[PDB]
Amino acid sequence: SLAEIVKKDDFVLDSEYLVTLLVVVPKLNHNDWIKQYETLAEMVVPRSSNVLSEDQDSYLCNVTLFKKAVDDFRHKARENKFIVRDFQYNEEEMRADKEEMNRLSTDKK
Amino acid sequence: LSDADVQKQIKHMMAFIEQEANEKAEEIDAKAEEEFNIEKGRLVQTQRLKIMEYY
Amino acid sequence: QSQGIQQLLQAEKRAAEKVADARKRKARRLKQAKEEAQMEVEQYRREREQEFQSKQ
C-alpha cells in the first residue's frame, strides 16, 4: 500500500472532468518516459504529470487525463507495458492507517 | 515534444469540457422551455379551474 | 506548471459560473413568467366577473 508513498501535491483539485491516473511499473519501458507521460492519452496534461517514486527496476508516477480518459489511459499504460496502479487518492485513509499503526505499536509496548 | 503540439491535446480536452458545459446549458434551456411551459400550464390550469368553479 | 494549471482553473471556474448563472436566471424567468401568466388570468377573470354581474 503506497499510502504515504504517493505525493498529494500532484493531485488535481476540483477533479470533476479531469483526474490523475497512476499506471507505471517497469523501468525497462521508461526510456521514453518523458514523452510517454506528456502524451499518455489524446488529452494528457504535459506539465502536471510527475513521478513520485523510482525503484531500481521500476518507477511510480501520476499523469493527468480527462474524466472520460480513465479507461483510455489504462489501455495506453497496458500497451506501454505498465502495471495497474490504481490509487483512489485515499489521502484521508493514509492518515488513518498511520494513526492505527501508531496505536498498535504503542498498544503492543 | 513541444508546447504547441501539446496545446493540441490540451485544446481537445478543453473542447470536451466546453462541450459538456454546452450540453448542460442546452439542458437548462430545454428545462426553461419544456418544464417551464409545464409549470406555467399547471399553474394556469389550477387557477382557471378554481376560478371557473367559483364562477 | 502553476500558470498552466491556473489557466485551466479559470476555465473550470467559468464553466461552473455559467451553470450557476443559468440556474439563477432560469429561476428568475420562471418567476416572471408565472407572474405574467397569473396577471393575464386574473385580468381575464375580472373581466368575466364584470360581464357576469352585468348579465345577472
From Swiss-Prot, chain A:
Chain's gene name: Atp6v1c1
Cell compartments where the protein resides: Cytoplasmic vesicle, Secretory vesicle, Synaptic vesicle membrane; Cytoplasmic vesicle, Clathrin-coated vesicle membrane
Tissue: Expressed in brain (at protein level).
Residues of the full protein shown: 165 to 273 of 382
Domain of life, source organism: Eukaryota
Name of the featured protein: V-type proton ATPase subunit C 1
Assembly, per entry: V-ATPase is a heteromultimeric enzyme made up of two complexes: the ATP-hydrolytic V1 complex and the proton translocation V0 complex. The V1 complex consists of three catalytic AB heterodimers that form a heterohexamer, three peripheral stalks each consisting of EG heterodimers, one central rotor including subunits D and F, and the regulatory subunits C and H. The proton translocation complex V0 consists of the proton transport subunit a, a ring of proteolipid subunits c9c'', rotary subunit d, subunits e and f, and the accessory subunits ATP6AP1/Ac45 and ATP6AP2/PRR.
Its job: Subunit of the V1 complex of vacuolar(H+)-ATPase (V-ATPase), a multisubunit enzyme composed of a peripheral complex (V1) that hydrolyzes ATP and a membrane integral complex (V0) that translocates protons. V-ATPase is responsible for acidifying and maintaining the pH of intracellular compartments and in some cell types, is targeted to the plasma membrane, where it is responsible for acidifying the extracellular environment. Subunit C is necessary for the assembly of the catalytic sector of the enzyme and is likely to have a specific function in its catalytic activity.
Family: Belongs to the V-ATPase C subunit family.
Curated annotation (Swiss-Prot), chain B:
Entry's Gene Ontology molecular function annotations: ATPase binding; proton-transporting ATPase activity, rotational mechanism
One of the protein's GO biological processes: synaptic vesicle lumen acidification
Keyword Disulfide bond appears in the UniProt entry: no
Major location category of this protein: membrane
Top-level taxon of origin: Eukaryota
GO terms for cellular component: apical plasma membrane; clathrin-coated vesicle membrane; cytoplasm; cytosol; endosome; extrinsic component of synaptic vesicle membrane; microvillus; vacuolar proton-transporting V-type ATPase, V1 domain
Localization of this protein: Apical cell membrane; Cytoplasmic vesicle, Secretory vesicle, Synaptic vesicle membrane; Cytoplasmic vesicle, Clathrin-coated vesicle membrane
Expression across tissues: Expressed in brain (at protein level).
Residues bearing PTM Phosphotyrosine: 54
Keywords, alphabetical: Acetylation, Cell membrane, Cytoplasmic vesicle, Hydrogen ion transport, Ion transport, Membrane, Phosphoprotein, Synapse, Transport
Similarity section: Belongs to the V-ATPase E subunit family.
Assembly behavior: V-ATPase is a heteromultimeric enzyme made up of two complexes: the ATP-hydrolytic V1 complex and the proton translocation V0 complex. The V1 complex consists of three catalytic AB heterodimers that form a heterohexamer, three peripheral stalks each consisting of EG heterodimers, one central rotor including subunits D and F, and the regulatory subunits C and H. The proton translocation complex V0 consists of the proton transport subunit a, a ring of proteolipid subunits c9c'', rotary subunit d, subunits e and f, and the accessory subunits ATP6AP1/Ac45 and ATP6AP2/PRR.
Role description: Subunit of the V1 complex of vacuolar(H+)-ATPase (V-ATPase), a multisubunit enzyme composed of a peripheral complex (V1) that hydrolyzes ATP and a membrane integral complex (V0) that translocates protons. V-ATPase is responsible for acidifying and maintaining the pH of intracellular compartments and in some cell types, is targeted to the plasma membrane, where it is responsible for acidifying the extracellular environment.
Protein name per its UniProtKB record: V-type proton ATPase subunit E 1
Organism of provenance: Rattus norvegicus
